[PDB]
Structure formats: structure tokens, C-alpha cells
Amino acid sequence: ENIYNRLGEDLNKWQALLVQIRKARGTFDNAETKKEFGPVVIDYGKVQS
Amino acid sequence: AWTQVLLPKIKNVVHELRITNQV
Numbered sequence: 001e002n003i004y005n006r007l008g009e010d011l012n013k014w015q016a017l018l019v020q021i022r023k024a025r026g027t028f029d030n031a032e033t034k035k036e037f038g039p040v041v042i043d044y045g046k047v048q049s
Numbered sequence: 050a051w052t053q054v055l056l057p058k059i060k061n062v063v064h065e066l067r068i069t070n071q072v
Contacts, residue, residue: 025070029069029070031067
């Protein structure tokens, strides 16, 4: 409801954040399971689904 | 011989099924 009120009657309804959400699907929805970085590996295994 | 192998060292070809944006 907060989002709806904030963006009620946007370009049509949102038309913008419905676009940036698709980009936000990054760091996510990829065959990669654990992001390695040097000797530090952050594993999104439990949250992936 | 290669054919009857298909049906000679053959490489194993593999490909996968995945899903993206729920497709």
C-alpha cells in the first residue's frame, strides 16, 4: 500500500520502478551460487530460492 | 566405426536445461 500510494497514477501506474526492478534482478537469478571475491566467498545458497 | 560408436575416441558433448525469469 505504501508503494501504491507513493506512485498512484505514475507515467501510467509505475512505469519506472517496474523497470528498475528488472535490473535489480541482478546479483540473483543466475547460475552462480556463491560469489567469490579474492579469498572471500559469500555464498547465497540458502536464500537462492 | 565412428558411426557405430555414435549409434574411435569420441568427445562427450553435454548441455544443460536452466530457467531464467521463469522460462
